[model samples]
Target: AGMGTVMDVLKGDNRFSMLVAAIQSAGLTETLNREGVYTVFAPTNEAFRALPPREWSRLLGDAKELANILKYHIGDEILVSGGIGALVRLKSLQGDKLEVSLKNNVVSVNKEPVAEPDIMATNGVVHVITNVLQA
Candidate 1:
């Protein structure tokens, strides 16, 4: 059976609680749940907790900025780790290109290495990352 939408998949994973809360607060849950292929570079709860208090508070207080940051972590196509070349750029939904690279059999996005990859969902795939991307 399919794992369900990207939002659903994220919700089911405890590591993505912070990401899910931000998505809900940003009003992007519905958008991510829709029928479309996406590749999400999802930051874990540890990533959010590790951010500077000022930055974290600003993100929580500003809906637009939070949404923009979240969008920057997503690409509009399915990009599995194995399919990625040694180095590549993926244009994100936020209008910025994300640098993706493979080094020593490890995959990284925008310098943040993916902790877990190829988490399949009905709408897309999720790659668990350790940091919030700055793009």
Candidate 2:
């Protein structure tokens, strides 16, 4: 299967700088680079900066927990807006369910807004999220 590295995707996106830092700090660069199709619900740098410092700092030190949270944003299948509905259920890489709702042409996954959509990748697609979806 064809797959592209997450770092390769985000390196040029200046808007994702903070998120890139978070990924590095959490030591998830390698994991995301592994071969496999993954639908990443990427949070922008602004999204990461919006987080409370305490929680952000804590998560940065816990690689496993951070990885789990990151994996929670990924899915085994490509999920685009066309596939979204009132209650769209997605199975995350973490083996957890992620639910999304659509209203007024706006999409929210697990209560987080999708700021940007349909970012296609070699492995899969990415949707830029405005907030981090917690378990």
Candidate 3:
């Protein structure tokens, strides 16, 4: 389980199908597959589906915009879910910041609760968030 990169873990998870496709379309597949620690606030398929079909299509067609949105989900540091106690802010690869908080035993990023937390990977961690955050 620990042998694969973050991208590998995401690819194997059915819940992340939309995210995986977004990563590929954003041309960020290699960055996640490479040897670098990262914490990804991944949005599930449901979150992606919540977007309007036209907006989703627009994102898929606009490479730079898609890349910015994807990069906003990834952080350079490895922030283990277990270690989060107080509110914290993490700067993303896209130059934006995400606010992470733990309350009532639930972890949330930017007020969006994480459905699945602490998914370990060789490179870092993945926390499945409830919504697709805009960058």
Candidate 4:
């Protein structure tokens, strides 16, 4: 339901181009296209660009690893911006717990700040992260 909305946001925000490309490369576009409630913690293009070149290159060649990293940022339930707080726990699609916190309006997941939040999609929501989540 939110596929079009999500795509429009991605297209409008140049910062997400890298993420869009990576999702396509990993063949996850279709997965995201499906109808389901999800919360996506998206990393911006600058975020991906900020990574060590070696790591970036490595991820491009490893679909499984890329998928794991991407999936780690996604949850089966939709979490809106207001729901975030000083400390919140979310269960990831990968069966992992994602710890989130907010300080001075800055939201972080396991200490990683969310640069952009509440990019609402028909089926879910998207929060952009400044840094790539490791593990």
Candidate 5:
């Protein structure tokens, strides 16, 4: 039920509370809300919480740094699984590269394997990864 944009879908779900907060903290709420778009390597609340509290707290206060980190999770192209190859690399909006490897029908983003994939929203698509990735 992706009733709204990427931001709306995530914000509308309590499961993505941490993610919504992080986007707000990073000041990327507008971007996620409107940029009709691309592949978003979503990290779960557990993934963000996996960060040490010290680091998460640090990011919560640093908007610029946090924004850069968040950008790494968004890519420029619309990625749909069936078209992906065995091994692929996606360039992020932040100019960093994320390695996506598809093997034996399993997809992994960075070192974290995907939990839920191909969630479509009005402007983009999202895949839930096991952990948060650094840019």
Candidate 6:
């Protein structure tokens, strides 16, 4: 069976529980489910909790603002499990460019190494990142 949409997949995985809440708070759940193709650079619970002052907790409060911030991690592609062939730049839905690279067999996005890469979802792929990416 298919893994279901990105939102469904994220919700089912406890690692991204916080991210799911933020998506709901931002009213982005439906959009992500329907988009059909998004490369979500998803931060794990630990990554979200590591920020100073508990930034992830605060970011979800304002639906409008953090929603934009969350969108920054999304890209339009079915990128394979590794690099983009080389050092490459990809555009996020937030209209910003994110750097993706492979070096020493490490996959990095904006220099943040993916803790776990290319987790497939029916709607897209989820790259577990160690840090919160900001624009």
Model 6: per-residue Cα lDDT over 26-79, one tens digit each:
997777788567888888888776676556556776887778878888887656
Candidate 4 lDDT by residue in tens digits, 48-86 = 866888876777888766777777788778778898987
Q: Give the TM-score of candidate 3.
A: 0.91
lDDT order of candidates, top first: 1, 3, 5, 6, 4, 2
| Count of residue pairs whose backbone atoms collide, per candidate | 0, 0, 0, 1, 0, 0
TM-scores for all candidates? Answer: 0.92, 0.83, 0.91, 0.86, 0.90, 0.88
User: Worst lDDT window (10 residues) for model 1?
Assistant: 1-10
lDDT of 6: 0.79
Quick one: how many clashes does candidate 6 have? 0
**Which candidate has the top score in TM-score?**
1
Q: Per-residue alpha-carbon lDDT of model 5 for 1-135, expressed as tens digits? A: 447887877877777777888889888777777757778888888898778888777778898778887888887777867655777888888888878878777888876788877887788788888688874
lDDT of each: 0.83, 0.74, 0.83, 0.75, 0.80, 0.79
lDDT of 2 at 122: 62
lDDT of 3 by residue, 74-131 (tens): 8878888876667888878888887888998988887788887899888989898868
Candidate order by TM-score, decreasing, is: 1, 3, 5, 6, 4, 2
Name model 2 segments beyond 4 Å from true: 1-7
Candidate 6 regions off by >4 Å?
Answer: 54-58
Model 1 RMSD, rounded to 1 decimal: 1.7
CA lDDT of 9 in candidate 4? 52
Q: Ten residues in a row with the worst lDDT in model 4? A: 1-10
lDDT of model 6 at position 44: 85
Candidate 4 local lDDT, residue 123? 70
Which candidate, 2 or 6, has the higher TM-score?
Answer: 6
Model 1 segments more than 4 A misplaced: none
lDDT of 2 at 128: 78
